[model samples]
Target: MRTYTFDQVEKAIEQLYPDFTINTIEISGEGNDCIAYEINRDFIFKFPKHSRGSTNLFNEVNILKRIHNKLPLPIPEVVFTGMPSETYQMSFAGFTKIKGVPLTPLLLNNLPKQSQNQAAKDLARFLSELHSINISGFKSNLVLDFREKINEDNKKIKKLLSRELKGPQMKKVDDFYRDILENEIYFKYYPCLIHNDFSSDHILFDTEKNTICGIIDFGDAAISDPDNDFISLMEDDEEYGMEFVSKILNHYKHKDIPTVLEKYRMKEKYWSFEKIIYGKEYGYMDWYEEGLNEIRS
Candidate 1:
């Protein structure tokens, strides 16, 4: 992956928008695929680090265009775009900034009870709107075979944890895989347009107003099981886990609540394993250790 310097980003911005004056350009966030720079506190420019990131950036731009102004909450609106150039190899984009801090688990836990409930309802409504969007024309790159993906992941998890976990503990993990694999209910769900990365970091919250202000990051948006969007509501703490998730589900307009909740429960159980797998793949030892520690406890 290509690493971008602050100077390169500034130069790129200057070249992309010749008339726009840039007084400040600071890195707002960095992820596996892209590095985001907040410019003038009014705009966010994201530069893809690699070829795949570039592809996803273009896809995200298109998706954002389609969904812009359609939902109740504010989403990134592409204001400027740049093609591959001398300063940057991949295509990049800038969006009008959505003002708010990340609605992290800690922040959510600290909010008043009414604020928390309101946040849940706000998020629930946003997801309902997003999931119901017409995605028939768009081609999904996601692998939709749940059983195959789960089985593949389980094999890897077994190998990774074979020595770390005792026989009984390992059997518990195996049983989880077996139970889900055997149940047809786990495999059934109507695929919809989903914000694949609906974690707290992507959810923006207004501290003063005590409400969800906006949602950011749609790079992972795709047509997938709607339950995938709800996984972020499940936290390590019980109060914020299924309890909060259930509250969100109460307002979600799903045809089959019982099965969706069942699927959510199953997905929640498997999330830890996914963290480990993702950690290993992305070379993030923190996440790898976190996943291992969660399983051990």
Candidate 2:
């Protein structure tokens, strides 16, 4: 972890929110594009380290603002936005701190077996509604469909590597790209507004109800694949994640899992490998290392 002078963050807090304080800084939090630091109840401020100029964080704020109680499940309340600001020198956003504990993988440890399954099913239902909503109101023009973007990802990866194989990584690169090229056409195609990033930390839940209460971090939202929302489900907890998939598929009104599962499952793996590989070239070795374990895990 890296350390910073509270002096640095203080200016940002005061600039946008005059009364905010660094109540309990959580510098060690997990995220790829940015670092999250919790503040006093006034709000939670997130500071982006690099990936500056992103609209999703603020997009999340705006979307949540527009959909709050209207959201199928509870959503975080955004307080301020700083994406286009030059002062912080990066994209950032703030939200009203949620009152519940994060439903971490650890949270599931003490949960009853049924609660874990219910949590999965509830999460699925929540995502079903989220995907069902229309978010054309967001201000950016997103340009590619799921299939086009997958091919684009392949082309980008292919362009970065040298012909000479160095460190066994080169062939893995070839294999991943080939995997996408060979089997990219089987999944459903929907231009539904996507969460872009749907991971463990972003999805919050209530222990008392065994249901998802919130999903923040719209830092990656866009008109993209709905399947991306299930990426987290497909990766770390494939089986439990299946429950989430099952419910969403049900919401889409599909009952045949065995037939469709294989196709979506393959695309899920391709997209996962593609994302991890993209992160590798773009300076996120942590995801690279963990994601590379698809070979082993």
Candidate 3:
């Protein structure tokens, strides 16, 4: 994760927010996929240090701008629209920070199995609210396509795998990548708005108030699987996930579950851990390691 000190970021901020001086730098967050900085007051900045993750930053800013006001939930609004800068930084986005702690620490690496029920129930409510919208208006503004993205991903992953292959895990990962090729009904579901990169860091918790604002990281925001949002949290707490998902599914009124469940995503997830750069080749290589470490400990 790349983050400049307040002084280093101040130089960049001078270019972007000359009107306002960044009072302090709160360097608490580290996301392997994207580098971020939370500045004084309610402001946060996200940018990609690497090329593969560039699109996510762009998507996040794009969606944050489009849906900031329309949605009932509170989301980080884009303060600066980060365009490609040849010199200073890559694609990035700035936002007015929302307040909350990550629910991870409270859950204590997710071992308090009883809390699983409440967490699940809470997240389910969150998902229900999120999935209630179409977000089609914001789709075109962002670069990636939703329905065929998996097909494109498969093709790209295959091309990427051509260069290097890992051990057995890579084999299964490769097989899964190919499996999507034949899955004719891939991504065949209602295209509702989704917080594509929802995660614990992205999520802010108001324990005192007992409310979750909204998951940040609009980079992966799309009209795809709501179930996919539960990927990480469910890994930590199953009952919470299942119960929460139950409500979300109820609110969306979906008769069938997503073709890819949390467990299935997990299988592909673990494969990436062994095959790819722990997940860097894909999206969550480092994150996969973190999740694995937490589970093992």
Best by TM-score: 1
Model 2 TM-score (2 dp): 0.74
Which lDDT tens digits does candidate 1 get at residues 1-297? 678898888787777688988888899989888999999999999998877787778778878988888999989899988887553444689998998999878889899999889998999999999988887778656435678888999999999999989988898888888998999886776778889888888998899898999998998887778887876566556325777777888888656767767776777677789889988876788999988988886
- Which of the predicted structures, 2 or 3, would earn the higher lDDT when compared with the native? 2
Query: Which model, 1 or 2, shows the larger lDDT?
Result: 1
TM-score of 3: 0.71
Worst 10 residues of 3 by lDDT: 233-242
Runs in model 1 lying further than 4 Å from the true structure: 84-90, 109-112, 142-145, 151-179, 236-239, 254-258, 286-297
Better of 1 and 2 by TM-score: 1
| Alpha carbon lDDT of each predicted model | 0.83, 0.61, 0.59
**Residues 12-71 of candidate 2: C-alpha lDDT, one tens digit per residue:** 666766765566655535454566667655466676655333343555556666667756
Extract clashing residue pairs from model 3: 42-97, 60-218, 116-240, 120-240, 120-244, 124-244, 196-220, 278-285, 279-285, 280-285
lDDT of 3 by residue, 209-278 (tens): 5556566667667766565665544443432344445544555465655554634464445444343334
> Which whole-number lDDT from 0 to 100 does residue 149 have in model 3?
55
The TM-score measured for candidate 1 stands at 0.80
Compute each candidate's TM-score over C-alphas.
Answer: 0.80, 0.74, 0.71
lDDT of 2 at 38: 70
Which portions of model 3 miss their true places by more than 4 Å?
1-5, 87-91, 105-122, 139-178, 236-244, 258-297
Question: Using lDDT as the measure, what is the rank order of every candidate, best first?
Answer: 1, 2, 3
